[PDB]
């Protein structure tokens, strides 16, 4: 008397198989591939984790079946690249979230390491944490597209403007890029991911500017998926800011976001400024959402984000044959247990695709890579192109770019 969980097209993800005659159990056909989102039961058909626990009442007849928003073909290829990229880079964990730009539907949600819900004996209480909703890390350079949007909105800068990116000092702390550049343009600021460029913008604006924009894209706001351990991130509510706090805010200092939240930011970028709620159940279109940023400004920055994936950007590794993509890379220094920064990194690559008319938002988070490279452009960017390349071609998206 236990309902069945399926993906958005009917594929079984949690079935009650009869074993032993009359008595039945619970089988998970995808296994580790979708473990964290799906969860598991006990011997009493009681949900303990994931969708199995969140919908335990609906799945017993207080019995109905539940069509998730996941596409198992997409979940499988997300997991295949994410799992083998955690291993290859010898990382602590890795998370990836794939969201439908037009409906906020979660088409995939994966972590490595994982566990097998068909035989969870020996697996501790960790490794059952859904990293996509429980990990909170500083977003780093991935917020920079929103800084350009705010600057264009507040009239501080115009599309064709050359910024002075020579290093400088704010109070005691100094600001410098990975590679020194005497000057840069807006498209160049995001291309090279210039910490100096965006910090100059953050100082020519009231501190409330970036606070308003980041929130309009969902940061610090709950995701309301209903799952266990779903964290809302740490968000600054400061009444007064320092000059160094405003500057480092433009490249991901002073806030912590879950991978699910960061995927919602890029679904709002790919919708050109429409903010839609996230869903792990198959939705009935339409999903109108709320307009949170002017369309013309987000399209302008979406186009700027293409040069990250083109020769010169810090994300050329993510390129895909025959498609335009608009992405942003990111590297964050991890915070230690004492509250100060250690020598461990979070490698990001977030983006939308295809750039001509984005249909999918994708986020790749690789926690603590230790194998030769540590920054997103070399660690998570090639994973982005592998996943998104598989996504665009599985979903039969018309090729975009002459390549
Ligand atoms: C954006 O996230 C931003 N970085 C930060 O603001 C934060 N930390 O920065 C770390 C330093 O990161 C890098 C160092 C070196 C390289 C690199 N070798 N790049 C080469 C360029 C030419 C082609 N080959 C590769 C890349 C990154 C640090 O902690 O020291 C940060 C923000 S919040 C927080 N806790 N940390 C930059 C530096 C722009 N990373 O962007 S990127 O796209 O990964 O390159």
Short mmCIF file of C-alpha atoms and ligand atoms in Angstrom, two decimals:
data_model
loop_
_atom_site.label_atom_id
_atom_site.label_comp_id
_atom_site.label_asym_id
_atom_site.label_seq_id
_atom_site.Cartn_x
_atom_site.Cartn_y
_atom_site.Cartn_z
CA UNK A 1 0.00 0.00 0.00
CA UNK A 2 2.93 2.28 -0.86
CA UNK A 3 2.85 4.72 -3.76
CA UNK A 4 5.51 4.88 -6.45
CA UNK A 5 7.92 7.75 -7.17
CA UNK A 6 8.68 8.37 -10.85
CA UNK A 7 10.61 10.92 -12.86
CA UNK A 8 8.79 13.49 -15.00
CA UNK A 9 8.10 10.93 -17.77
CA UNK A 10 7.21 7.86 -15.70
CA UNK A 11 10.53 6.12 -15.09
CA UNK A 12 10.47 4.29 -11.72
CA UNK A 13 12.66 5.81 -9.00
CA UNK A 14 11.04 4.22 -5.91
CA UNK A 15 8.86 1.11 -6.32
CA UNK A 16 7.31 -1.32 -3.84
CA UNK A 17 8.37 -4.75 -5.12
CA UNK A 18 6.67 -7.88 -3.70
CA UNK A 19 9.36 -10.09 -2.15
CA UNK A 20 8.51 -13.16 -0.11
CA UNK A 21 4.86 -13.34 -1.18
CA UNK A 22 2.33 -10.79 0.03
CA UNK A 23 4.96 -8.88 1.99
CA UNK A 24 6.59 -6.13 -0.08
CA UNK A 25 9.76 -4.05 0.13
CA UNK A 26 11.10 -0.85 -1.46
CA UNK A 27 13.37 -0.87 -4.50
CA UNK A 28 15.22 2.12 -5.96
CA UNK A 29 16.00 1.42 -9.63
CA UNK A 30 18.51 4.26 -10.09
CA UNK A 31 20.29 3.51 -6.82
CA UNK A 32 23.14 5.84 -5.97
CA UNK A 33 22.41 8.02 -9.03
CA UNK A 34 19.49 9.77 -7.29
CA UNK A 35 19.98 8.66 -3.68
CA UNK A 36 20.11 12.03 -1.91
CA UNK A 37 16.95 13.48 -3.48
CA UNK A 38 14.93 10.26 -3.32
CA UNK A 39 15.96 9.05 0.13
CA UNK A 40 14.76 5.76 1.65
CA UNK A 41 12.28 4.04 3.96
CA UNK A 42 12.70 1.69 6.89
CA UNK A 43 11.06 -1.73 7.32
CA UNK A 44 7.73 -0.04 8.22
CA UNK A 45 7.37 1.85 4.91
CA UNK A 46 8.22 5.03 6.83
CA UNK A 47 10.08 7.79 5.02
CA UNK A 48 13.38 8.79 6.61
CA UNK A 49 15.14 10.93 3.98
CA UNK A 50 14.51 12.91 0.81
CA UNK A 51 11.31 12.76 -1.21
CA UNK A 52 10.48 9.48 0.52
CA UNK A 53 10.14 11.28 3.88
CA UNK A 54 8.84 14.62 2.57
CA UNK A 55 5.89 12.92 0.84
CA UNK A 56 5.44 9.99 3.22
CA UNK A 57 1.79 10.89 3.84
CA UNK A 58 0.80 11.36 0.20
CA UNK A 59 2.53 8.07 -0.72
CA UNK A 60 0.40 6.00 1.68
CA UNK A 61 -3.19 7.27 1.34
CA UNK A 62 -4.09 9.46 4.32
CA UNK A 63 -2.34 5.93 -1.87
CA UNK A 64 -1.06 8.02 -4.78
CA UNK A 65 2.07 8.12 -6.93
CA UNK A 66 4.39 11.11 -7.31
CA UNK A 67 5.88 12.37 -10.58
CA UNK A 68 9.00 14.34 -9.74
CA UNK A 69 10.36 17.08 -11.99
CA UNK A 70 13.59 15.11 -12.52
CA UNK A 71 14.50 13.75 -15.96
CA UNK A 72 16.32 10.51 -15.25
CA UNK A 73 18.29 10.61 -18.50
CA UNK A 74 19.60 14.01 -17.39
CA UNK A 75 20.09 12.96 -13.77
CA UNK A 76 22.15 10.00 -14.98
CA UNK A 77 24.59 12.04 -17.06
CA UNK A 78 24.90 14.75 -14.42
CA UNK A 79 25.81 12.07 -11.90
CA UNK A 80 28.19 10.27 -14.27
CA UNK A 81 30.34 13.37 -14.79
CA UNK A 82 30.00 14.77 -11.27
CA UNK A 83 30.88 11.46 -9.62
CA UNK A 84 33.94 10.87 -11.79
CA UNK A 85 35.07 14.49 -11.47
CA UNK A 86 35.01 14.33 -7.66
CA UNK A 87 37.19 11.23 -7.94
CA UNK A 88 39.46 12.58 -10.69
CA UNK A 89 40.18 15.81 -8.77
CA UNK A 90 40.21 13.95 -5.42
CA UNK A 91 37.65 16.38 -3.98
CA UNK A 92 35.75 16.15 -0.70
CA UNK A 93 32.34 16.36 -2.35
CA UNK A 94 30.71 17.66 -5.50
CA UNK A 95 27.22 18.97 -6.23
CA UNK A 96 25.37 19.76 -9.45
CA UNK A 97 21.88 21.20 -9.93
CA UNK A 98 20.11 21.50 -13.31
CA UNK A 99 17.05 23.77 -13.48
CA UNK A 100 14.52 24.50 -16.23
CA UNK A 101 14.81 28.21 -17.04
CA UNK A 102 11.17 28.54 -18.04
CA UNK A 103 9.45 26.62 -15.20
CA UNK A 104 11.84 26.43 -12.23
CA UNK A 105 11.56 22.64 -12.45
CA UNK A 106 14.55 20.74 -11.06
CA UNK A 107 15.64 18.51 -13.94
CA UNK A 108 18.58 17.05 -12.00
CA UNK A 109 20.11 17.17 -8.52
CA UNK A 110 23.25 15.15 -7.86
CA UNK A 111 26.08 14.78 -5.36
CA UNK A 112 29.24 12.73 -5.02
CA UNK A 113 30.03 10.83 -2.89
CA UNK A 114 26.64 9.12 -2.61
CA UNK A 115 25.18 5.95 -1.11
CA UNK A 116 23.10 3.01 -2.25
CA UNK A 117 19.57 3.19 -0.80
CA UNK A 118 19.06 -0.46 -1.80
CA UNK A 119 21.64 -1.50 0.86
CA UNK A 120 22.36 1.47 3.13
CA UNK A 121 23.87 -0.65 5.91
CA UNK A 122 27.21 0.78 7.02
CA UNK A 123 26.57 4.17 5.41
CA UNK A 124 26.83 6.80 8.19
CA UNK A 125 24.49 9.72 8.92
CA UNK A 126 26.73 11.85 6.73
CA UNK A 127 26.94 10.95 3.03
CA UNK A 128 23.15 11.14 3.47
CA UNK A 129 23.29 14.93 3.72
CA UNK A 130 22.02 16.40 0.44
CA UNK A 131 24.96 18.70 -0.27
CA UNK A 132 22.97 20.72 -2.84
CA UNK A 133 20.72 22.03 -0.03
CA UNK A 134 22.88 21.54 3.10
CA UNK A 135 26.27 22.93 2.07
CA UNK A 136 26.63 26.70 2.39
CA UNK A 137 29.74 28.20 0.78
CA UNK A 138 30.81 31.65 -0.31
CA UNK A 139 29.71 32.10 -3.94
CA UNK A 140 32.88 33.86 -5.03
CA UNK A 141 33.24 35.30 -8.53
CA UNK A 142 29.88 33.78 -9.61
CA UNK A 143 28.03 36.83 -8.25
CA UNK A 144 29.91 39.17 -10.59
CA UNK A 145 27.26 39.07 -13.38
CA UNK A 146 24.80 40.60 -10.91
CA UNK A 147 27.29 43.36 -10.06
CA UNK A 148 27.46 44.38 -13.74
CA UNK A 149 23.65 44.35 -13.91
CA UNK A 150 23.38 46.62 -10.88
CA UNK A 151 26.01 49.00 -12.25
CA UNK A 152 24.22 49.24 -15.60
CA UNK A 153 20.91 49.73 -13.78
CA UNK A 154 22.14 52.41 -11.37
CA UNK A 155 23.64 54.45 -14.27
CA UNK A 156 27.12 54.07 -12.76
CA UNK A 157 28.52 52.55 -15.96
CA UNK A 158 27.43 52.03 -19.56
CA UNK A 159 27.72 49.00 -21.83
CA UNK A 160 30.79 50.31 -23.69
CA UNK A 161 32.86 51.62 -20.79
CA UNK A 162 36.53 51.09 -19.99
CA UNK A 163 37.27 50.61 -16.29
CA UNK A 164 40.63 51.24 -14.67
CA UNK A 165 41.68 47.88 -13.21
CA UNK A 166 45.15 48.79 -11.90
CA UNK A 167 45.43 47.32 -8.36
CA UNK A 168 44.79 49.56 -5.36
CA UNK A 169 44.27 49.50 -1.58
CA UNK A 170 41.01 49.94 0.33
CA UNK A 171 41.82 50.82 3.95
CA UNK A 172 44.54 48.27 4.82
CA UNK A 173 43.58 45.42 2.50
CA UNK A 174 44.68 45.42 -1.14
CA UNK A 175 42.71 44.47 -4.26
CA UNK A 176 44.33 42.68 -7.20
CA UNK A 177 43.41 40.39 -10.07
CA UNK A 178 44.83 36.98 -10.92
CA UNK A 179 46.51 38.63 -13.92
CA UNK A 180 47.31 42.34 -13.90
CA UNK A 181 45.47 44.53 -16.41
CA UNK A 182 45.84 48.29 -16.71
CA UNK A 183 42.24 48.61 -17.93
CA UNK A 184 39.26 46.45 -18.85
CA UNK A 185 35.80 46.73 -20.37
CA UNK A 186 32.57 45.37 -18.91
CA UNK A 187 32.70 42.24 -21.07
CA UNK A 188 36.37 42.01 -20.12
CA UNK A 189 35.62 42.41 -16.42
CA UNK A 190 33.53 39.21 -16.49
CA UNK A 191 35.76 37.50 -19.06
CA UNK A 192 38.94 37.75 -16.97
CA UNK A 193 36.81 37.80 -13.77
CA UNK A 194 38.42 41.02 -12.57
CA UNK A 195 38.19 41.52 -8.80
CA UNK A 196 39.45 45.10 -9.23
CA UNK A 197 36.88 45.93 -11.89
CA UNK A 198 33.81 44.84 -9.95
CA UNK A 199 35.09 46.26 -6.66
CA UNK A 200 35.44 49.68 -8.29
CA UNK A 201 31.78 49.32 -9.25
CA UNK A 202 30.75 48.27 -5.72
CA UNK A 203 32.24 51.46 -4.25
CA UNK A 204 30.36 53.80 -6.62
CA UNK A 205 27.05 52.44 -5.27
CA UNK A 206 25.23 52.44 -1.93
CA UNK A 207 25.90 49.22 -0.05
CA UNK A 208 22.17 48.46 -0.37
CA UNK A 209 22.59 48.13 -4.14
CA UNK A 210 24.23 44.69 -4.23
CA UNK A 211 22.15 43.66 -1.21
CA UNK A 212 18.98 44.42 -3.16
CA UNK A 213 20.11 42.74 -6.38
CA UNK A 214 21.42 39.50 -4.83
CA UNK A 215 18.18 39.13 -2.87
CA UNK A 216 16.08 39.78 -5.97
CA UNK A 217 17.84 36.73 -7.45
CA UNK A 218 17.03 34.63 -4.38
CA UNK A 219 20.18 34.63 -2.24
CA UNK A 220 19.41 34.43 1.47
CA UNK A 221 15.86 33.28 0.63
CA UNK A 222 14.53 29.79 1.27
CA UNK A 223 14.00 27.43 -1.66
CA UNK A 224 10.85 25.81 -0.20
CA UNK A 225 11.43 22.42 -1.82
CA UNK A 226 10.33 20.87 1.48
CA UNK A 227 13.33 18.57 1.90
CA UNK A 228 15.10 17.76 5.16
CA UNK A 229 18.21 19.81 5.90
CA UNK A 230 17.29 22.44 3.30
CA UNK A 231 19.39 25.44 4.37
CA UNK A 232 18.73 29.09 3.45
CA UNK A 233 22.32 30.34 3.50
CA UNK A 234 23.98 33.06 5.58
CA UNK A 235 23.09 36.53 4.34
CA UNK A 236 24.35 39.94 5.55
CA UNK A 237 21.77 42.15 7.28
CA UNK A 238 24.35 44.79 8.22
CA UNK A 239 23.10 48.26 9.10
CA UNK A 240 26.50 49.80 8.27
CA UNK A 241 29.25 48.64 5.90
CA UNK A 242 32.95 49.25 5.61
CA UNK A 243 34.59 50.17 2.32
CA UNK A 244 36.39 46.83 2.21
CA UNK A 245 33.18 44.91 2.96
CA UNK A 246 31.33 46.58 0.07
CA UNK A 247 34.23 45.87 -2.29
CA UNK A 248 34.75 42.21 -1.39
CA UNK A 249 30.98 41.69 -1.59
CA UNK A 250 31.19 42.20 -5.36
CA UNK A 251 33.18 38.95 -5.63
CA UNK A 252 31.57 36.67 -3.09
CA UNK A 253 32.85 37.62 0.36
CA UNK A 254 30.43 37.94 3.26
CA UNK A 255 27.60 35.62 2.18
CA UNK A 256 27.02 31.88 1.96
CA UNK A 257 24.68 30.14 -0.48
CA UNK A 258 23.57 26.58 -1.14
CA UNK A 259 24.14 25.10 -4.61
CA UNK A 260 20.36 24.98 -5.07
CA UNK A 261 20.14 28.73 -4.35
CA UNK A 262 22.94 29.49 -6.80
CA UNK A 263 21.14 27.46 -9.46
CA UNK A 264 18.05 29.60 -8.88
CA UNK A 265 20.15 32.72 -9.48
CA UNK A 266 21.16 31.46 -12.91
CA UNK A 267 17.65 30.34 -13.80
CA UNK A 268 16.72 33.99 -13.15
CA UNK A 269 19.62 35.12 -15.33
CA UNK A 270 18.56 32.72 -18.07
CA UNK A 271 14.98 33.97 -17.88
CA UNK A 272 16.35 37.49 -18.43
CA UNK A 273 15.12 38.69 -15.04
CA UNK A 274 12.04 36.57 -14.22
CA UNK A 275 12.20 34.89 -10.80
CA UNK A 276 10.33 31.58 -10.61
CA UNK A 277 10.03 29.21 -7.64
CA UNK A 278 11.86 25.89 -7.62
CA UNK A 279 9.91 22.63 -7.80
CA UNK A 280 10.85 18.96 -7.45
CA UNK A 281 7.43 17.80 -8.66
CA UNK A 282 6.25 17.86 -12.26
CA UNK A 283 4.64 21.24 -12.79
CA UNK A 284 1.65 22.28 -14.88
CA UNK A 285 2.67 25.20 -17.13
CA UNK A 286 2.58 28.13 -16.99
CA UNK A 287 4.84 29.32 -14.15
CA UNK A 288 4.64 33.12 -14.37
CA UNK A 289 7.16 34.15 -11.71
CA UNK A 290 7.96 37.74 -10.78
CA UNK A 291 9.92 40.31 -12.77
CA UNK A 292 12.90 41.27 -10.58
CA UNK A 293 15.25 42.95 -13.06
CA UNK A 294 14.82 44.74 -16.41
CA UNK A 295 15.00 42.36 -19.35
CA UNK A 296 17.30 44.52 -21.48
CA UNK A 297 20.02 44.67 -18.81
CA UNK A 298 20.06 40.92 -18.19
CA UNK A 299 20.28 40.18 -21.91
CA UNK A 300 23.23 42.56 -22.19
CA UNK A 301 25.05 40.75 -19.40
CA UNK A 302 24.06 37.32 -20.70
CA UNK A 303 25.87 38.26 -23.89
CA UNK A 304 28.88 39.42 -21.87
CA UNK A 305 28.93 36.01 -20.18
CA UNK A 306 29.51 34.26 -23.52
CA UNK A 307 33.09 35.51 -23.71
CA UNK A 308 33.90 33.53 -20.56
CA UNK A 309 33.38 30.35 -22.61
CA UNK A 310 35.22 31.82 -25.63
CA UNK A 311 39.00 32.10 -26.15
CA UNK A 312 40.21 34.46 -23.42
CA UNK A 313 37.65 33.77 -20.72
CA UNK A 314 38.37 31.81 -17.58
CA UNK A 315 35.96 29.15 -18.76
CA UNK A 316 36.99 28.23 -22.30
CA UNK A 317 37.36 24.65 -21.06
CA UNK A 318 33.56 24.55 -20.75
CA UNK A 319 32.99 25.20 -24.47
CA UNK A 320 30.54 22.96 -26.36
CA UNK A 321 30.62 22.26 -30.08
CA UNK A 322 27.80 23.89 -32.01
CA UNK A 323 26.33 25.87 -29.11
CA UNK A 324 26.54 29.30 -27.52
CA UNK A 325 26.76 29.23 -23.74
CA UNK A 326 26.84 32.04 -21.18
CA UNK A 327 28.67 30.96 -18.03
CA UNK A 328 30.58 32.35 -15.08
CA UNK A 329 33.43 30.67 -13.25
CA UNK A 330 34.33 31.00 -9.59
CA UNK A 331 36.88 30.00 -6.96
CA UNK A 332 36.29 30.42 -3.23
CA UNK A 333 38.65 29.97 -0.30
CA UNK A 334 37.09 27.64 2.26
CA UNK A 335 36.55 28.82 5.84
CA UNK A 336 38.20 26.71 8.51
CA UNK A 337 36.65 25.43 11.71
CA UNK A 338 38.20 28.39 13.57
CA UNK A 339 36.29 30.74 11.24
CA UNK A 340 39.30 31.87 9.17
CA UNK A 341 40.31 30.93 5.66
CA UNK A 342 42.35 27.77 5.07
CA UNK A 343 44.06 26.49 1.90
CA UNK A 344 41.03 24.56 0.62
CA UNK A 345 38.92 25.76 -2.30
CA UNK A 346 35.41 25.55 -3.73
CA UNK A 347 35.52 25.43 -7.54
CA UNK A 348 32.45 26.75 -9.38
CA UNK A 349 31.12 26.93 -12.88
CA UNK A 350 27.59 28.28 -13.29
CA UNK A 351 25.89 29.20 -16.52
CA UNK A 352 22.94 28.97 -18.87
CA UNK A 353 22.56 27.53 -22.36
CA UNK A 354 21.99 28.09 -25.21
CA UNK A 355 22.99 31.76 -25.13
CA UNK A 356 20.65 32.62 -28.02
CA UNK A 357 17.64 31.60 -25.90
CA UNK A 358 18.58 29.94 -22.60
CA UNK A 359 16.62 26.83 -21.68
CA UNK A 360 18.68 25.30 -18.85
CA UNK A 361 20.55 26.67 -15.84
CA UNK A 362 23.40 24.52 -14.53
CA UNK A 363 25.59 24.78 -11.43
CA UNK A 364 28.71 22.67 -10.77
CA UNK A 365 30.26 22.81 -7.28
CA UNK A 366 33.44 20.85 -6.50
CA UNK A 367 34.42 20.97 -2.81
CA UNK A 368 38.14 20.86 -1.91
CA UNK A 369 39.90 19.72 -5.12
CA UNK A 370 43.43 18.50 -4.41
CA UNK A 371 45.12 17.04 -7.53
CA UNK A 372 47.02 19.73 -9.37
CA UNK A 373 44.44 22.44 -9.96
CA UNK A 374 42.05 24.13 -7.56
CA UNK A 375 40.19 26.83 -9.53
CA UNK A 376 36.86 26.50 -11.29
CA UNK A 377 38.17 27.35 -14.75
CA UNK A 378 40.21 24.14 -14.85
CA UNK A 379 38.33 21.97 -12.32
CA UNK A 380 34.60 22.61 -12.87
CA UNK A 381 34.48 24.27 -16.30
CA UNK A 382 35.15 21.05 -18.29
CA UNK A 383 32.50 19.28 -16.20
CA UNK A 384 30.03 22.02 -17.16
CA UNK A 385 30.58 21.42 -20.87
CA UNK A 386 30.32 17.66 -20.46
CA UNK A 387 27.04 17.84 -18.53
CA UNK A 388 25.52 20.69 -20.56
CA UNK A 389 26.73 19.13 -23.80
CA UNK A 390 24.94 15.94 -22.83
CA UNK A 391 21.88 17.89 -21.71
CA UNK A 392 21.52 19.97 -24.88
CA UNK A 393 21.87 16.93 -27.12
CA UNK A 394 19.63 14.62 -25.08
CA UNK A 395 16.96 17.34 -25.12
CA UNK A 396 17.36 17.85 -28.90
CA UNK A 397 18.21 21.54 -28.68
CA UNK A 398 18.93 22.99 -32.12
CA UNK A 399 22.65 23.81 -32.55
CA UNK A 400 23.35 27.46 -31.89
CA UNK A 401 26.86 28.49 -32.92
CA UNK A 402 28.72 28.01 -36.20
CA UNK A 403 31.74 26.01 -34.98
C1 LIG B 1 36.34 34.78 -8.06
O1 LIG B 1 35.79 33.91 -7.42
C2 LIG B 1 37.80 35.18 -7.88
N1 LIG B 1 38.42 34.73 -6.63
C3 LIG B 1 38.05 35.19 -5.43
O2 LIG B 1 37.55 36.29 -5.31
C4 LIG B 1 38.25 34.42 -4.23
N2 LIG B 1 39.34 33.81 -4.08
O3 LIG B 1 40.28 33.84 -4.93
C5 LIG B 1 41.34 32.84 -4.85
C6 LIG B 1 42.34 32.89 -6.03
O4 LIG B 1 41.84 32.27 -7.24
C7 LIG B 1 42.55 31.99 -8.41
C8 LIG B 1 43.95 31.98 -8.46
C9 LIG B 1 44.62 31.67 -9.66
C10 LIG B 1 43.95 31.37 -10.85
C11 LIG B 1 44.73 31.06 -12.13
N3 LIG B 1 45.88 30.50 -12.01
N4 LIG B 1 44.23 31.39 -13.35
C12 LIG B 1 44.92 31.21 -14.64
C13 LIG B 1 44.63 32.38 -15.60
C14 LIG B 1 45.13 32.11 -17.02
C15 LIG B 1 44.74 30.73 -17.51
N5 LIG B 1 45.21 29.68 -16.60
C16 LIG B 1 44.59 29.86 -15.29
C17 LIG B 1 42.56 31.37 -10.80
C18 LIG B 1 41.88 31.67 -9.61
C19 LIG B 1 42.00 32.86 -3.46
O5 LIG B 1 41.32 32.61 -2.42
O6 LIG B 1 43.23 33.13 -3.36
C20 LIG B 1 37.21 34.32 -3.18
C21 LIG B 1 36.01 35.03 -3.22
S1 LIG B 1 35.09 34.60 -1.79
C22 LIG B 1 36.30 33.54 -1.23
N6 LIG B 1 36.15 32.78 0.01
N7 LIG B 1 37.35 33.50 -2.08
C23 LIG B 1 38.68 34.83 -9.08
C24 LIG B 1 40.09 35.02 -8.56
C25 LIG B 1 38.52 35.87 -10.17
N8 LIG B 1 38.49 33.42 -9.62
O7 LIG B 1 37.85 33.19 -10.83
S2 LIG B 1 38.15 31.97 -11.79
O8 LIG B 1 37.22 32.01 -12.96
O9 LIG B 1 38.10 30.62 -11.10
O10 LIG B 1 39.47 32.12 -12.47
#
